[PDB]
Design a protein around this ligand. Structure first.
Ligand SMILES: CNc1nc(N)[nH]c(=O)c1N=O
Ligand SMILES: CNc1nc(N)[nH]c(=O)c1N=O
Ligand code: NA
Ligand code: NA
Lengths: 257, 249
């Protein structure tokens, strides 16, 4: 399985680590953090602001363009690494593609006005995430959501092969819902689409272990390994070095299988 | 549910347990108890005492006082790393729960000593590595049964490392769940080993992420006991595994 963007491809025959680059001189700092993550083994750099954390300050289109576009450009000028952009705004989707973004990572699944059209115009891969807010058990709910959103994307001219699916760990989901989704993650392979997951330092680790946000590495690695053994294709994390190390062990095991 | 029984207590293996490594090889006693205490507080539910071939009198001197001290002070289960009948016998007398013999009771008198104790025994394996290990287990289970050790006293360990090469180690890890056909506890030890070091290219003190990854892969396949150096982090990883397996209804 492969993804295609900007005339290049990403080989999803093994898990990839996507490193989180939060950009909320900031530019020079962002490039150096990206370099560190690439050196540690990240093969996708995920560029975004603070505003995707629940509770965080909302920002203008103007501020998002000012913060994200130059960082995407600076990475494309320095590195061959794939670049994902965390945005829900159609103008950021449009402008990010123009400076070399490979993946549109919208936790709102292109629900904001004009986002669906902008994404379609770029022809880029798009990650669709389940969230409560976005326009029986929790697996079935998320599975139904994916069916619906895949349909919506396709109706707008976005080929299925451009889509990635993310069951959306966290974002207010309680402990049992999060672990149900992780336990059943492999069942989402029935769509034959890349699975992207993000559990790094989230509540499902913090609340389970009763530890603060800086004390969640071991739990985060365990989540990553559990997902990757179930064939998750991209793992979005804060701690790239350690996750990549864990993925080496996963890859050795799946190879032996 | 799978349980083990020893010294008038039981070990419930319906969830993974972390067994902390306690190397006594050379006061030494005071430091051994302190380390044991730290690992217990970090969530180890078995402490694995080993002091190593050294003479049997050396081994008795190193190991027995430590087992005895831990048994007197704590309620934690204790496993003893030994191949020698005298140490098996004396360990049992001072409160040990599991005989952990990497040589699977092959040394003279070991089998009889193990049977006489009535304690749980861990059997470790030392073209088709899965089939060879599986056949080994079949043979050793029969050997133990013949000596009067009930099958329900046995634990099986495929013996990661010990000169098995990288490919063989990962074949065994990938297929670990297939050893459940014996209906016996699976014990595994991958912590800080070369099967991690060779892949990560980091020294023994830098291998935690790989050690945790091995531990999680094994536990998601139903391994019952994970033998490790780094207890607190492994215990955390196991809670995440338990939350996942529990959610699988
Ligand atoms: C932009 N942030 C995220 N993106 C995706 N796709 N999935 C997450 O869990 C996530 N969590 O923060
Ligand atoms: C005493 N040492 C060990 N014991 C067991 N059962 N398994 C190991 O891998 C091991 N590795 O060192
Ligand atoms: Na870090
Ligand atoms: Na440690």
């Amino acid at each position: 399985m492969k993804l295609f963007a900007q005339g290049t491809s990403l080989d999803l025959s093994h898990p990839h680590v996507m490193g989180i680059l939060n950009v909320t001189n900031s530019l020079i700092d962002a490039v150096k953090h990206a370099n560190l993550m690439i050196n540690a083994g990240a093969t996708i750099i995920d560029v975004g602001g603070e505003s995707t954390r629940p509770g965080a300050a909302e920002v203008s289109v103007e501020e998002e363009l000012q913060r994200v576009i130059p960082v995407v450009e600076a990475i494309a000028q320095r590195f061959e690494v794939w670049i994902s952009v965390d945005t829900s705004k159609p103008e950021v989707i449009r402008e990010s593609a123009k400076v070399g973004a490979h993946i549109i990572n919208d936790i709102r699944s292109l629900s904001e006005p004009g986002a669906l059209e902008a994404a379609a115009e770029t022809g880029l891969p798009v990650c669709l995430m389940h969230m409560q807010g976005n326009p029986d058990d929790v697996f079935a709910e998320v599975n139904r959501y994916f069916i619906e959103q895949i349909a919506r994307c396709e109706q707008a001219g976005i080929a299925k092969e451009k889509l990635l699916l993310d069951p959306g760990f966290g974002f207010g989901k309680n402990l049992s819902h999060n672990y149900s989704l992780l336990a059943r993650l492999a069942e989402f392979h029935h769509f034959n689409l890349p699975l992207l997951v993000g559990m790094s330092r989230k509540s499902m680790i913090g609340q389970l272990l009763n530890v603060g946000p800086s004390e969640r590495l071991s739990g985060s690695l365990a989540c990553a390994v559990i997902a990757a053994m179930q064939g998750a294709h991209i793992i979005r994390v804060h701690d790239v070095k350690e996750t990549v190390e864990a993925m080496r062990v996963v890859e050795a095991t799946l190879s032996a299988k």
